[PDB]
Design a protein around this nucleic acid. Structure first.
Length: 155
DNA sequence: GGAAGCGAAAGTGTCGCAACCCGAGAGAGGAACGATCTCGGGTTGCGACACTTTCGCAACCCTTAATACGTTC
């Protein structure tokens, strides 16, 4: 991981410098170049810049995945490295995952959830609390506070 | 990267069919010699197709991993 991060330091620096001028923010989770902006029709030229910079730096060793270049807007689904971005411009787990978690908690309510699924639900709830703290409050309201407290356990 | 099988893709040879040629022959006419149409090989050109070569998909995962629960690369 650290070698991979260092080998892309110059690429990250040059891409960030180019993107800040055109009001584009750039992040990379070591394989996922994410570019976003509020200016329309500004992200069209980003892939060409990426290709020319990669050819300048790494030659033919590192290449973009052209089948993995996706344009998205508020008209469609928007998720970055697993976190859905809402039309309200806030982080979310996605409606489908939230309904799955709700079903898991409902199954735990009637005692139809086994130990493996219970541990999976506890891990998912911790991840949700990290990502969507308001979802925990909503589940506390919907499924009562005592049920949630017994599900997460006590120290 | 690439077993083992197998099939795609492209190139090359081959082989049968058509088209024609050329000599032999029975004998039309009409009064003889041999016109004319056919029989039997033989040659050549051509194109469909079989055969030949190369490439590429992707087993396994090497001695050599860790094992609370969840996302991400």
């Amino acid at each position: 991981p650290v070698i991979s991060n260092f080998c892309m330091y110059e690429f990250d620096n040059r891409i960030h410098a180019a993107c800040k001028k055109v009001e584009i923010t750039y992040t990379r989770y070591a394989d996922d170049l994410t570019f976003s902006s509020n200016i329309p029709d500004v992200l069209k030229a980003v892939p060409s810049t990426l290709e020319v910079l990669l050819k300048d730096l790494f030659g033919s060793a590192l290449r973009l995945n052209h089948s993995k270049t996706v344009f998205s807007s508020k008209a469609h689904n928007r998720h970055v490295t697993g976190i859905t971005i809402n039309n309200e411009e806030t982080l979310s787990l996605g409606r489908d995952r939230k309904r799955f978690i709700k079903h898991l908690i409902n199954q735990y309510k009637y005692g139809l959830l086994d130990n493996e699924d219970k541990a999976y639900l506890i891990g998912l709830l911790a991840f949700a609390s990290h990502i969507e703290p308001s979802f925990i409050t909503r589940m506390n309201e919907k499924y009562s506070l005592e049920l949630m407290e017994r599900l997460r356990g006590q120290r």
